[PDB]
From a paper:
In contrast to most characterized families of anion channels, which tend to be non-selective among anions and sometimes poorly discriminate against cations, the Flucs are arguably the most selective ion channels known, with >10,000-fold selectivity against the biologically abundant chloride.
For all four mutants, we measured fluoride channel activity using either single-channel electrophysiology or bulk liposome efflux experiments, and we solved x-ray crystal structures of the mutants together with Br-. In accord with the fluoride transport experiments, a strong anomalous peak persisted in the S81A structure but was weaker in the S81A/T82A double mutant. In both cases, the densities shifted away from the channel center toward the external solution, moving about 2 Å closer to the vestibule Arg22s.
Numbering used by the authors:
A (entry chain A): 2 to 126
B (entry chain D), D (entry chain C): 1 to 96
C (entry chain B): 1 to 125
Write the structure that this text describes.
């Protein structure tokens, strides 16, 4: 029950952020909507740092780990929007940006996780 | 707030029995365009055909010489809020 | 913007709680490509793809329900961060074959479930 | 409900100064195993080194012939709930 509040409090902030970020920005470059991208990189950044930090503090309350990863990162990022955008571009005959959207999101959100992880790995050393 | 409607719809080439229409795409992911045409004198049926979202021109053929036609073009587009939807039309009158 | 905010939170928490519950039950059952996170992304891919084609036929739906389904439920039910850590974890563990498989199955499987949801409903109507 | 601790840890090949330890990997994604070993008797400094997760074996060297050693092995693994965390250890004795 206390864990369901971590997911709901953490996931509400993330869903709200992804919403405010996705409407205020997505329409500016329809070939690769940038609101659905920043939340995914920013959530990839946060999960990467969450990865390295939670390792060095094994005694953290699972409430705060749940709020940041399953809640915040989970709500903030989104596969659905990334699909319809790519599905929209495939149905529009825009194969080059469908492939680029896929390539950028995946290569990018991994690079943003490796960045968050090693920045904390390196700061602790 | 980004307009989903095309702009500058115009007949760029004409014979008595065909029109080459063109337009300028909107600032949105456009999946396909619908071109609609028919006799302006509301005494004739309307026809519609899709063109891919990559094309910004279309040929209307089989027309009657010396007749006034209404030509309209609207989009089926992906936005973030509305997902798939149909935009309002841009319309021109043109006599062959 | 206050009513619109509730649609995101309600649908999102339902989406999030959903993703939380499913992920802790099934994720451990096959760690090379966790099935929990894979289902909520195929499911949301399905739900957004059907929402893609049903919203198209009902152009007068309250933006409250479209917001609660797409941005909220589909937005919260799905995640990109957990698919990034699981790929970054397979990479730091040298399971390169499965890291690549996880990228393909999520990207391709979620587009299929979006096309499935779209054309199943396009064909009904 | 899936244990992160390795199982069936045994010295499989031995010489006077080295031990080849092997283990069964847990059904979790393991990033690296941590091998530790010290002289069972009392207060010798326990030494430890990491082994990549793809490997499930490890060689320990620089030991004195005729000494009882305590070789423990645990994991740095990824589970969905804890992200990166450490496992409880599995341990053996072996006298060279
Ligand atoms: C990596 C795999 C992911 C999963 C699979 C996703 C598949 C998504 C696209 C399916 O939808 C079709 O795409 C065609 C190509 O875009 C469109 O052709 C339309 O546009 C073409 C443009 O060349 C025209 O030639 C066609 O006549 C016209 O129907 C067609 O309408 C549309 O229904
Ligand atoms: C195309 C998208 C790219 C996005 C960015 C991807 C970044 C990936 C980072 C992976 O992190 C490294 O992975 C190595 C390989 O797994 C590990 O080597 C470890 O594991 C190897 C294989 O088991 C051993 O040979 C090494 O000695 C050992 O240090 C290493 O520790 C770890 O930090
Ligand atoms: C697009 C960019 C792609 C490349 C990204 C970087 C991949 C290579 C990393 C090289 O640096 C590594 O740093 C690790 C520490 O972070 C070391 O891990 C050592 O310590 C780790 C724990 O900190 C263990 O898990 C490892 O097995 C052990 O080799 C490892 O020796 C060292 O080489
Ligand atoms: Br997550
Ligand atoms: Br979404
Ligand atoms: Na989400």
């Amino acid at each position: 029950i206390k864990s369901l509040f971590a997911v709901i409090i953490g996931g509400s902030v993330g869903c709200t952020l992804r919403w405010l970020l996705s409407t205020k920005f997505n329409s500016l470059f329809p070939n690769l909507p940038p609101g659905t991208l920043v939340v995914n990189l920013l959530a990839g950044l946060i999960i990467g740092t969450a990865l390295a930090y939670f390792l060095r503090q094994p005694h953290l309350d699972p409430f705060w780990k749940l709020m940041i990863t399953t809640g915040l990162c989970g709500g903030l990022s989104t596969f659905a929007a990334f699909s319809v955008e790519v599905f929209a571009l495939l149905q529009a005959g825009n194969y080059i940006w469908a492939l680029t959207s896929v390539l950028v999101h995946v290569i990018g959100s991994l690079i943003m996780t490796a960045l968050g992880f090693f920045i904390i790995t390196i700061l602790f050393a | 707030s980004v307009s989903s409607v095309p702009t500058k719809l115009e007949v760029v080439a004409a014979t008595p029995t065909s029109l080459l229409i063109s337009w300028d795409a909107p600032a949105v992911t456009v999946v396909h365009y619908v071109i609609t045409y028919g006799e302006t004198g509301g005494n004739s049926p309307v026809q519609e055909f899709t063109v891919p979202g990559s094309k910004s021109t279309a040929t209307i053929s089989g027309l009657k010489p010396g007749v006034d036609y209404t030509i309209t073009v609207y989009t089926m587009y992906y936005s973030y809020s509305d997902l798939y939807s149909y935009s309002s039309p841009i319309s021109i009158n043109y006599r062959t």
